Design a protein around this nucleic acid. Structure first.
Lengths: 388, 621, 656
RNA sequence: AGAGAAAUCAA
RNA sequence: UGCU
């Protein structure tokens, strides 16, 4: 493929032309990417620039230099009128190309002309600015896994297992479907920008008189104001108890950072023996439960499937693993929310606690692997896990 | 921090940029341990092949992308922080080398990969010894023997065992020489520790005084302030011309014109009429560029810098002293009220033609209706025509002031009415401008049409009688140098419509919000403190006066105006507080009027606003 | 001014924006800055003592003073040490949850800070060229200098950068070989590190007298950045900070809260007099040391958090070009100390063209940590009000039960800020007793309404990129102005109309010019806003792109829609999430040794950008050098290809 | 000349 | 050489 030949030639030219710069470290890219001596703003030099004899800096192509006494090409530099000439008596492209060249904009326009606006009413209502998600997204993605989701969408082969783990699945598939044509027609940087704008959850301060849904927050500069308001129109898995000797307790532990400040974060745990049938998409099965340990787990999962998050859901259900329910994470939790999230991030980055709690077996007949994957070859297998 | 003898140069160069060695505890030793592990891996994987491919694929210190590619072909994936050092393709296992001080505590780290245990003297663990060949063990033992003799030569044995026991310890140490430099200009050390018991002293402060009455500003006494602006403002008239382009109108004016001087000012000599007539002719032919003429050195200040430097250096009498600059103090000119009244006069045309935006929702209709009614209120006014003249003049002057031309450029101020007739508001005349910064001043020769001549108001403008088609109009002529930034910001002078629009919009919306109904022709009574008495005008007249006052404040904006407004915002707030029957208290040395009085020197509208402040009830009781 | 104070149908505070100077030129500074900086340096020494004793005052290393030496009448420069200890202890014991976030930042986020973020800054004075340079150039020059002198490769983290900066000062002689053989000593390098480059603050509104600003050198920017992110992390979590991250919601909550009727309310809003020439860095060193010592932080953290301020205690402010001296009508500029002037006490503290100053801060530096020093003073038993302060602007809501207690707490607030040198302005602080009417930052508060008032008018002027993107920025700016409450329905629509008219003019789409006549006989129907066609964006439609809106409304049909969005067009081939690449998405047409380096780095960036898709999404992070990384990536992409083995091996052979 | 305001522009 |  000639693209590889061009890449090799360009690399050789860069090495020969710029030896010292090529010898810099790769991590210095974040420094020398923005290397420019350009120093306000070019808004001043616009009215004069557009009226220059040859403002447009075009590339060598098939453009008529003189049409009806045009003088549109000097051979490059082009006249200001050639952008207008490419709107009539020019070359056209396929309907798929024009449909796929803009996708997010079509979604934003379609949402605007799809809502039944009510009757505008006027009053002394006072808006208070609150942080709400800017625009609707195709999927609910946290602001931390967006780069990893983008890496999985665009460069699946250049990634790491940790990056895949800290990436929202499901959104990747839809993004791939919606951006397979866009990446083909536009540039890589523009494709990345459109993708992030599709999935980014950027909390922006907006006027708020009533609770704004993500749809309403996008169009809020006219819905509400100081004098008027027009009115518009564990994670995913689930659990079910089958045989519980005693009912679930509501014990809570208090964390005392100082004698004057305390927090009450309650953790929910079983007692005696229990059996819960956990269901999550393709993952299904029931596992025996102890006071705080696990006796047996039965899982029915597709071959070579990621089985880390369902087990983390299981661990939170019974407060099984210690380092996230009694022993703090090294810092005083301000509230229950971030404690819930920080548990699922720390214990997803590393899962040593689960392996220590359940133990390791030296045989290979056990299906589940220490990397929390279903039915894969490994040098060792986690114990006390079977299939239905 | 040099390369150990037992470590190859390639290994050291590879290990240089793999981790931040300088900022870790026991640096230059953890790096040596990692180099030991990498060398052990290389010796284990030394030219050994199996099934036509190398038996051992080392993974330590390799790019993550190619590691993932190799692992994908081998049907296995590994995490970032627990990746194996090497993989045994012969029996499909992964091994990571782990130097240990004692071989008794084998301690299998994890089931993902079997470990390889080696001591500091050479002997390996039984599992890793029986899984590998004898030559590999011999080579590793020899390499570890050389490493151990190097260590005991430089007695880092405790450091080596500490690095083996630990994993990573971040640190940042400041040297002894840097410490002496740092503590040159301070009484404490790098880590402050004063020998004082913490306590908050009880200090006896002053008492807070109530603002019983609002402060009175200090009116300044002196000669009345002249009109110092680019254009003539409210005294700006236009000459009707037959429909056509700018060149046709200029040619017609040049053909029908008789120029006689009425008032001559020393600031602008009457001889600079010749260059203006030459510019009229040149623009009439079609080229608005002319060669320099004799009556231009005293018109555009050519060689004035060198001439004035030579004149000043001719005397050179006195002694060096600090440069002291005095700003002349001026009183309130009588013409401020005249301009305010004239700028409110009603014209025939609308003078504000802005394209109406589209309407798709009910909210869009309300906004467009409000904007249309606001434009109707402040459109048929003289101030709108003056704003349009200022915009046209500033834009035409700026468009021709981007190169470094050394020849006179012509930028006529011509506007066109809806019918199509040209309107000669005046003319800007560029001079030789070798501009280099946005703050540099470019010479100009403003020639514009008056409506009334007043020597005190225009001490520098020269007035010439102009006769055009049985009609006689005055003609101003002033020499002015004006900067790039000022021309740019006056090219968008139409932005001044925003503030009166905001006031009108808030009044209308508050009226519509008291009840629940949008009227759009509400004209309430706005009570104001006019001439002391509380007489109220209409909303339409108030917005009209607000626009004129803001336009005057814009073209007369200077540091005095900025400081005056900034320091009077708080006084306006205090006045509102006392209106709301509220008490205002001040600290000991509180003189809020002092911060305002220092900004009143010679600005006309600043003095006018000061008089407006000192035309109000003092005590609100 | 009688027109700006309505008495009915509208409040005087509602007409407060008429007291602004949006339109009209902004003040600009002319000539030398020496006089301004010299008057800025003298103030810390004049106000140190009750009576002006500058000559004796130029002997004080630490601004610590005694309670009886504090000037309760005028400005006072300096701090009380025991007061700083007690106030820091009080500010740590209270708001303790906000201190664990600092612990998490230090233990986790601090080691992960990259020194590449230093390139996203202002212009930096470079000790190589002795000339203001953009941040990337100064950063790369400093990194190359450190690598040449330390004979080691600097790590990607900011801590490694600071360690390298600390280590380079231990070398007695330093060089920057590379045609050029500039040589430095330890003292010269120290002076370059201490030197602050002063410049005028241009285009500043609201002030009558011009003021100067300074920026740190690259040798101390890493330390300053570390301390400033620490200060930001502390300020983002305390209710007494006017940080923009909080969104100034705190003022809204304080305005909307109710109060027991019998309780006597009150609200003090004012400015701080000479904020940046009264504060002494030693107070901030002491406060930071207390904060990191009561957190149980390691010793090296406490050491690291004191270089930024201890270097500033030895600052060498750049005087400028000199002081103006005149004989007759001729003006000559001379350096300080050449001729008698109004600054002769400071001739001793002259180092070449720089002036030393132990006492006092300077504008443009330590903005965030100055707020912390102004907030520890609030934490006292007597003070029971709510404070919201952002740099030299505060607001206090008193909630006393009696007037005498109100004034006692007001005087306590005035005095406690003077224990560290904050020095609130007597002529700028106004207290309203019955209820809340005041101002903070640019906001104005009256009863339950807090409205944003702009300081500078939104520039309704077209930018210089291209019409398609320019309309996007214009509409985004208008939408942002409306969203902050500064604008509303009619004002927003009028701003849109003005911007649209100027935008049409600036691209020759208005009147009779060459473009519009070119579209006359050629039958080029105007279909876009930049072509002079009817506008398509409405007030409710600032957030949608032009082409998609026109397609949905049937204005660009499909024949023209296909032609203007052709990817093979000759012309082509507050983030702006619009302007799909089209025909009208074009570009216009616009010490010398740095230029060649510019094209070299541009080539390196271009080759990296193609072989590394992941640098577009995440910051680059990979051990090794650029050459090896590119070589291995090329080998990988060759092997990953579907070609046969011989083509791959000859491609690898061609790689060299 | 003038612009201007604490000091520069009129190369 | 054409912004109401």
């Amino acid at each position: 493929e000639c693209t590889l030949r061009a890449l090799v030639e360009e690399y050789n030219g860069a090495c020969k032309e710029a030896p010292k710069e090529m010898s810099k470290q790769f991590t210095d890219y974040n420094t020398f990417k923005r290397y420019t001596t350009s120093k306000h703003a070019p808004q001043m030099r616009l009215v004069y620039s557009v009226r220059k004899p040859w403002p447009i800096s075009m590339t060598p192509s098939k453009e008529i230099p003189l049409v009806f006494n045009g003088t549109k090409l000097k051979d490059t530099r082009a006249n200001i009128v050639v952008p207008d000439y490419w709107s009539k008596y020019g070359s056209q492209t396929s309907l798929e190309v024009v449909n796929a060249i803009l996708y997010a904009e079509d979604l934003k326009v379609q949402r605007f002309f799809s809502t039944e606006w009510g009757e505008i009413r006027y009053g002394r209502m006072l808006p208070f600015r609150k942080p709400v998600q800017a625009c609707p997204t195709i999927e609910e993605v946290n602001p931390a896994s967006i780069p990893h989701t983008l890496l999985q969408v665009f460069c699946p082969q250049y990634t790491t297992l940790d990056s895949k783990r800290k990436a929202h699945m499901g959104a990747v598939e839809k993004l791939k479907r919606v951006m397979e044509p866009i990446c083909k027609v536009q540039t890589q940087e523009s494709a990345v920008h459109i993708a992030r704008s599709l999935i980014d959850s950027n909390k922006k301060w907006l006027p708020t008189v009533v609770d704004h849904t993500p749809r309403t927050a996008e169009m809020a500069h006219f819905l509400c104001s100081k004098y008027h308001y027009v009115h518009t129109n564990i994670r995913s898995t689930k659990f079910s108890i089958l045989n519980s000797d005693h009912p679930r307790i509501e014990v809570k532990k208090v964390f005392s950072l100082s004698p004057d400040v305390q927090v009450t974060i309650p953790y929910r745990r079983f007692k005696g023996k229990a059996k819960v049938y956990f269901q999550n998409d393709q993952i299904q099965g029931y596992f025996s439960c102890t006071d705080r340990q696990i006796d047996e787990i039965k899982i029915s999962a597709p071959k070579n499937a990621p089985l880390l998050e369902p087990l983390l859901d299981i661990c939170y259900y019974g407060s099984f693993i210690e380092p996230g329910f009694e022993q703090t994470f090294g810092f005083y939790p301000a509230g229950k929310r971030e404690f819930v999230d920080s548990f699922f991030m720390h214990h997803s980055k590393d899962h040593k606690a689960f392996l220590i709690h359940m133990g390791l077996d030296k045989d290979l007949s056990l299906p589940l692997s220490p990397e929390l994957n279903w039915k894969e070859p490994a040098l060792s297998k986690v114990c006390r896990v079977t299939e239905l | 921090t040099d390369r150990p003898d037992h470590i190859d140069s390639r290994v050291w160069e590879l290990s240089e940029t793999q981790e931040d060695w300088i900022t870790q505890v026991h640096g230059h030793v953890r790096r040596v341990v990692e180099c030991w592990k990498y060398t052990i891996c290389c010796l284990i994987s030394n030219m050994h092949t199996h099934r036509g491919a190398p038996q051992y694929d080392v993974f330590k210190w390799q790019d993550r992308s190619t590691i993932e590619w190799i692992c994908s072909k081998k049907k296995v994936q590994y995490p970032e922080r627990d990746t194996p050092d090497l993989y045994d393709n012969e029996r499909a296992v992964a091994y990571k080398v782990l130097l240990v001080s004692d071989l008794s505590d084998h301690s299998p780290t994890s089931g993902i990969y079997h470990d390889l245990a080696f001591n500091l003297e050479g002997e390996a663990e039984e599992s890793c010894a029986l899984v590998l060949r004898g030559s590999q063990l011999q080579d590793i033992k020899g390499f570890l023997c050389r490493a151990l003799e190097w260590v005991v030569s430089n007695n880092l044995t405790q450091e080596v065992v500490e690095t083996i026991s630990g994993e990573a310890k971040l640190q940042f140490s400041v040297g002894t020489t840097f410490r002496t430099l740092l503590k040159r200009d301070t009484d404490w050390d790098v880590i402050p520790t004063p020998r004082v018991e913490p306590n908050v002293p009880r200090i006896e402060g002053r008492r807070w005084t109530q603002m019983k009455k609002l402060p009175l500003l200090k009116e300044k006494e002196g000669p009345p302030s002249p009109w110092r602006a680019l254009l003539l403002g409210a005294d700006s008239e236009y000459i009707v011309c037959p429909p056509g382009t700018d060149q046709e109108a200029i040619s017609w004016i040049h053909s029908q014109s008789e120029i006689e001087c009425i008032r001559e000012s020393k600031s602008t000599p009457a001889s600079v009429i010749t260059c203006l007539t030459s510019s009229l002719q040149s623009f009439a032919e079609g080229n608005p560029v002319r060669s320099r003429i004799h009556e231009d050195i005293i018109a555009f200040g050519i060689n004035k810098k060198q001439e004035k430097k030579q004149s000043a250096s001719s005397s050179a009498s006195g002694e060096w002293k600090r440069a002291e600059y005095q700003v002349e103090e001026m009183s309130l000119p009588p013409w401020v009220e005249e301009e305010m009244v004239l700028l409110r006069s009603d014209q025939e045309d609308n003078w504000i033609e802005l394209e109406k935006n589209a309407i798709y929702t009910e909210v869009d209709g309300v906004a467009e209706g409000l904007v249309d009614k606001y434009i109707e209120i402040v459109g048929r006014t003289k101030v709108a025509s003056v704003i349009e003249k200022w915009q046209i003049a500033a834009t035409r002057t700026f468009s021709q002031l981007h190169t470094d031309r050394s020849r006179i450029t012509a930028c006529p101020i011509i506007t066109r009415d809806p019918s199509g007739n040209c309107q000669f508001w005046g003319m800007v005349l560029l001079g030789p401008h070798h501009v280099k910064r946005d703050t540099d001043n470019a010479p100009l020769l403003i020639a514009e049409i008056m409506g009334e001549d007043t020597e005190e108001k225009y001490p520098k403008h020269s007035v010439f009688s102009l006769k055009v088609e049985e009609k006689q109009f005055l003609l101003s002529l002033k020499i002015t140098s004006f900067s790039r930034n000022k021309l740019y910001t006056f090219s968008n002078i139409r932005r001044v419509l925003i503030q009166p629009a905001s006031i009108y919009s808030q009044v209308v919306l508050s009226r519509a919000a008291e009840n629940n109904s949008l009227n759009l022709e509400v004209n309430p009574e706005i009570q104001l403190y006019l001439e002391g008495a509380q007489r109220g005008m209409t909303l339409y007249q108030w917005v009209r006066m607000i626009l004129c006052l803001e336009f005057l404040m814009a073209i007369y904006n200077n540091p005095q105006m900025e400081g005056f407004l900034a320091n009077m915002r708080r006084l306006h707030m205090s006045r509102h507080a006392m209106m709301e029957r509220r008490q205002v208290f001040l600290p000991f040395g509180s003189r809020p009027e002092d911060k305002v009085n220092e900004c009143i020197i010679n600005n006309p509208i600043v003095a006018y606003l000061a008089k407006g402040w000192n035309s109000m009830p003092n005590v609100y009781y | 001014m009688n027109l700006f104070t309505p008495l009915s149908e509208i409040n005087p505070t509602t007409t407060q924006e008429l007291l602004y100077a949006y339109t009209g030129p902004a003040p600009v500074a002319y000539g030398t800055r020496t006089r301004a900086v010299l008057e800025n340096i003298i103030r810390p020494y004049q106000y140190f003592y009750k009576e002006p004793n500058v000559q004796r005052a130029l002997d004080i290393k630490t601004g610590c003073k005694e309670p009886e030496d504090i000037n309760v009448e005028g400005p006072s420069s300096g701090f009380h040490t025991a007061s700083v200890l007690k106030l820091a202890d009080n500010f740590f014991r209270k708001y303790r949850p906000a201190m664990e976030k600092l612990k998490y930042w230090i233990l986790v986020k601090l080691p992960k800070l990259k020194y590449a973020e230093l390139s996203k800054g202002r212009q930096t004075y470079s000790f190589i060229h002795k000339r203001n340079l953009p941040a990337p150039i100064a950063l790369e020059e400093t990194v190359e200098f450190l690598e040449q002198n330390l004979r080691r490769k600097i790590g990607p983290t900011l801590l490694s950068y600071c360690q390298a900066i600390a280590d380079v000062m231990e070398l007695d002689e330093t060089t920057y070989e590379g045609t050029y053989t500039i040589k430095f000593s330890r003292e010269e390098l120290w002076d370059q590190m201490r030197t602050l480059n002063t410049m005028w603050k241009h285009l500043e509104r609201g002030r009558l007298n011009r003021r100067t600003i300074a920026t740190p050198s690259m040798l101390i920017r890493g330390f300053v950045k570390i301390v400033e992110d620490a200060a930001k992390e502390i300020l983002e979590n305390v209710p007494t900070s006017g940080v923009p991250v909080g969104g100034e919601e705190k003022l809204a909550k304080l305005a909307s809260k109710q109060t027991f009727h019998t309780a006597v309310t009150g609200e003090l809003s004012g400015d701080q007099e000479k904020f940046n020439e009264c504060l002494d860095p030693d107070a901030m060193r002491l406060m930071w040391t207390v904060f990191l010592r009561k957190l149980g932080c390691p010793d090296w953290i406490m050491e690291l958090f004191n270089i930024p301020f201890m270097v500033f205690k030895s600052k060498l402010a750049d005087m400028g070009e000199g002081l103006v001296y005149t004989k007759g009508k001729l003006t000559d500029r001379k350096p300080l100390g050449e001729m008698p002037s109004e600054f002769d006490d400071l001739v001793r503290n002259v180092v070449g063209n720089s002036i030393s100053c132990r006492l006092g801060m300077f504008m443009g530096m330590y903005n965030l940590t100055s707020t912390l020093l102004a907030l520890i003073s609030i934490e006292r038993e007597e003070l029971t009000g709510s404070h919201v302060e952002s740099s030299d602007d505060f607001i206090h809501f008193f909630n006393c039960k009696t007037h005498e207690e109100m004034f006692k707490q007001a005087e306590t607030l005035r005095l406690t800020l003077k224990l560290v040198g904050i020095n609130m302005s007597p002529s700028k602080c106004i207290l309203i007793s019955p209820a809340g009417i005041g101002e903070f930052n640019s906001k104005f508060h009256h009863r339950d309404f807090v409205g944003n008032v702009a300081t500078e008018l939104p520039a309704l002027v077209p930018n210089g990129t291209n019409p398609m993107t320019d309309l996007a920025m214009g509409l985004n700016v208008i939408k942002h102005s409306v969203n902050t409450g500064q604008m509303n329905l009619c004002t927003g629509a009028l701003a849109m109309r003005i911007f649209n008219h100027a935008y049409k003019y600036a691209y020759m789409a208005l009147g009779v010019t060459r473009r519009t006549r070119f579209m006359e006989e050629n039958a080029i129907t105007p279909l876009l806003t930049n072509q002079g066609a009817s506008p398509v964006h409405s007030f409710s439609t600032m957030h949608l792109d032009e082409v998609a809106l026109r397609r949905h409304l049937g204005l660009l049909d499909e024949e023209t829609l296909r032609r203007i969005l052709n990817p093979n067009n000759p012309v082509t081939q507050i983030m702006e999430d619009y302007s799909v690449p089209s025909c009208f998405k074009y570009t216009l047409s616009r010490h010398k040794a740095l230029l060649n380096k510019e094209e070299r780095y541009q080539r390196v960036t271009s080759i990296i950008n193609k072989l590394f898709p992941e640098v577009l999404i995440q910051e680059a992070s990979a051990p090794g050098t650029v050459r090896e990384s590119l070589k291995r990536r090329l080998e990988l992409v060759v092997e990953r290809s579907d070609l046969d083995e011989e083509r791959k091996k000859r491609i690898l052979s061609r790689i060299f």
